[PDB]
Amino acid sequence: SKRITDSQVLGELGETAIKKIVLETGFLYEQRGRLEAGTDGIIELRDPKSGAPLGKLLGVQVKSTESGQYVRENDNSFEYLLKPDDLKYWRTSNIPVIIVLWRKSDETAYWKDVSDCVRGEERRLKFDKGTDVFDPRSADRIGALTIDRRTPGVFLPPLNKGEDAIINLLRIRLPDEIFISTSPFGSGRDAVPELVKHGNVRFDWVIRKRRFVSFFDPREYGTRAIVDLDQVEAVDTKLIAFNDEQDDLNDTMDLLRRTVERQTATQLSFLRKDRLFHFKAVGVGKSRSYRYMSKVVSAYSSKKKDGWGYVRHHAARLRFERLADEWFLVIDPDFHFTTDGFQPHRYPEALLAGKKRLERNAAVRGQVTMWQHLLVESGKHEVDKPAPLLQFERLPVIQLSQAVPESSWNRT
């Protein structure tokens, strides 16, 4: 004759599921006994890193449904109505009380503070289906309920499991060989007109100490008089790139910069006065947009603004570093200004300061991702034409043990 209806089993299952979610987050959950009234359990916070309980408790009331839409449910949000006595009991307590709704059909949990009532209504809670999901990602927000924002000096450690951040370094895959040789000239400044005189011209070479260093074969192009043809040799790149000599390092960096300049000449253009790779404008007073993958999104590299007229081009002070016998390219986002798209805009301090001041972390991350995508794509041939000499690969994404509680800072 004894019966345990599916309603009680479903409620116990919902409580167990919420406890499991809380334990997955990293907190502690205590279930109240028979004498519970208006509070299904207590959540105690715990530091994910140190494992030390934080001693801050919050009550939890769990309501479970097998299926069925909530009040005014849609794709983006829904609504819930509280009992008046339950709300009064929650308000006369001394700890924050949250309510979690658990739907078994789709296995979803949505949490909200019982005091976060809809404007003008005491007992209505408007659950946002995008931000009110009960899961580890919400942990920080839950912790935000424990502390009183009014009293000073109270805080909470970051309660998220971790985060992922990228670096601006791009790993370079150097060619297995390097063309080293002698030369009539000790400095390339005098040699450049000699190369201009000959047939084929390309600026992917370095003259440092009467020695000629290049990635491409000097014989196959117009760089003939620049180099003694008899002494031309191709040697393993480990004898030029990965060594300890200072001038070898300087020549390697200069050659890498010139190779990147030539390889990315389709989209970029170099400014020697500031060593700045800025997106060249196609046509005077004609604009350009760039599409990159991060999910494909367009960043608008070149912008004019009306008035007297100034053109902002995205730019980067691409530099080179050698760490752990590997070569990395460092991307430093910046902006360049031109009067008509080609002639540099004199007096750009005001525009530069205005553009930099309003730039936050997200914008800089977007810019560096766009530059990384551009330099990665420029290293692909996809054949007729010589394959690009330098190929850049994104570094493995950096893992951080702690995360910024950004989700709890939407209204500081």
């Binding site: 000096g153 670096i167 972390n361 991350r365 560096v368 950096i398 950004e406």
Partner: protein, 480 residues
């Protein structure tokens, strides 16, 4: 690239109380070194308008100042007042007879001078005489506050001379700094001096910028200004507000920061140093000294013997307090350590028997950075090990503050240890991050630079106007 995030270093206040924020730590436990006597006699120099104006601000801070931004209560806390939660456990009183008034005729005398350099030097002589009178008498102030009037600020700082810039007609370069010159010329006086503009103690008063004449200067909220100003006043009174909480098992270490500054002519380059170590007890000693050498030049680095004498002085100064040479000597420099420098440091240590040393070049001009996903930068204390070079994020998102107190994406420090280094980069970054929280010139605890590096540059400003061979006080209270 293995990344690490350091938890905020622990600070020590009051009767051994610990907190991670100087403002909240002072409110709960009080200053680390309690003051004998409940009154801090503050002397004020300025016009009768500013002297009376600053006097009520000190009383106003005693009553209590509300928070300037209730949304972020940790970043902009209210000044408690004179109750149980008094940050410094003492009253900032201006005792009777401890005020000196700059007459309107005296101000007109300084303003009337045409050349900016001559006006500054004449003003320094005028204020120095008033400072001498203040300390000669029975006033006996603990710290002297110079409440500069608005007309004086325009001439001394903004170089306003009746509309036309006669000094700019001379086309001189590197106009004299009134503050740096004034501090140098009053080093012989026994009382530290503090310069205060009317903007801090009066929201109504506005001071225009030097170049942007239309625009006024923008200042923090009044509560934040009181927190930073009174903490400096308390420190200049002679008591350390807070100290890094020391680990029970750590090597007795002294941090030495090395910096450089120009020689008032824009060409030569001297070296200024700062030494930081514990006081064998609850205290923390921060000294600022100049190299005794005379090897003039433009190189932003030390030589062989000159670097050796710098360490010898630092060891001797440490030995004067602990009566034993330090176990570890951490040297922080603003420029890359060279072979001549490192062998100079090693020679001094060999003559003294120091076991462990670390030679770290703190670099801010590094293009390397990391970016998380979101509208906020990485957490403060984030560290990336870039093959023996430490990428330390001394500035960034602060969970305690609930935001990031900056203007753009923060620029990280790059710690480049020399080959002749003992500690691993992970421990060096942890020490450098801790040193940023012990800069007493402000109560906000997220400073980009470590204290020895920060203190070295501050010492260079004052010592730029001090003639070589003149013995000056090494106490950092005279420079901050």
């Amino acid at each position: 690239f293995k990344a690490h995030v350091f938890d905020e270093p622990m600070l020590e206040f009051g009767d051994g109380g610990q907190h991670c924020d100087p403002r909240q730590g002072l409110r709960e436990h009080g200053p680390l070194q309690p003051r004998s006597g409940d009154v801090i006699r503050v002397g004020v120099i300025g016009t009768d308008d500013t002297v009376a104006g600053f006097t009520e601000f000190l009383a106003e801070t005693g009553r209590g100042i509300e928070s300037g931004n209730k949304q972020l209560i940790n970043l902009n806390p209210d000044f408690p007042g004179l109750g149980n939660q008094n940050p410094f456990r003492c009253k900032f009183e201006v005792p009777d007879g401890a005020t000196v008034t700059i007459s309107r005729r005296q101000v007109n005398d300084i303003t009337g001078i045409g050349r900016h350099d001559e006006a500054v030097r004449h003003a320094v002589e005028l204020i120095s005489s008033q400072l001498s009178a203040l300390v000669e008498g029975s006033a006996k102030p603990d710290v002297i506050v110079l409440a500069l009037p608005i007309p004086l600020i325009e001439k001394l700082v903004n170089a306003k001379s009746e509309g036309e810039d006669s000094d700019d007609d001379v086309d001189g370069g590197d106009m004299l700094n009134f503050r740096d010159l004034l501090k140098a010329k009053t080093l012989h006086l026994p009382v530290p001096t503090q310069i205060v503009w009317p903007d801090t103690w009066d929201d109504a008063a506005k001071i225009p910028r030097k170049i942007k004449r239309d625009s006024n200067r923008q200042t923090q909220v009044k509560a934040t200004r009181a927190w930073n100003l009174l903490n400096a006043l308390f420190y200049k009174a002679g008591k350390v507000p807070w100290r890094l909480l020391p680990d029970q098992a750590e090597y007795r270490t002294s941090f030495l920061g090395i910096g450089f500054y120009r020689d008032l002519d824009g060409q030569q380059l001297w070296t200024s140093t700062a030494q930081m170590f514990d006081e064998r007890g609850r205290g923390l000693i921060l000294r600022g000294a100049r190299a005794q050498t005379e090897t003039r030049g433009r190189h932003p680095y030390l030589t062989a013997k000159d670097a050796e004498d710098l360490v010898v002085q630092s060891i001797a100064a440490y030995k004067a307090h602990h009566r034993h040479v330090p176990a570890r000597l951490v040297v922080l420099k603003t420029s890359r350590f060279r072979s001549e420098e490192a062998e100079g440091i090693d020679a001094a240590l060999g003559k003294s028997g120091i076991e462990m040393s670390d030679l770290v070049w703190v670099q801010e001009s590094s293009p390397i950075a990391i970016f998380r996903d979101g509208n906020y930068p990485v957490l403060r204390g984030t560290f990336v090990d870039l093959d023996g070079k430490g990428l330390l994020y001394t500035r960034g998102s602060v969970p305690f503050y609930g935001t990031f107190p900056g203007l753009r994406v923060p620029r990280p420090l790059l710690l480049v240890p020399h080959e002749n280094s003992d500690s691993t980069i992970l421990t060096l970054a942890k020490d450098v991050l801790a040193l940023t929280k012990v800069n007493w010139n402000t109560t906000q605890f997220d400073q980009k630079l470590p204290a020895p590096i920060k203190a070295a540059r501050e010492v260079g400003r004052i010592l730029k106007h001090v003639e070589f061979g003149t013995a000056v006080s090494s106490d950092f209270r005279r420079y901050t």
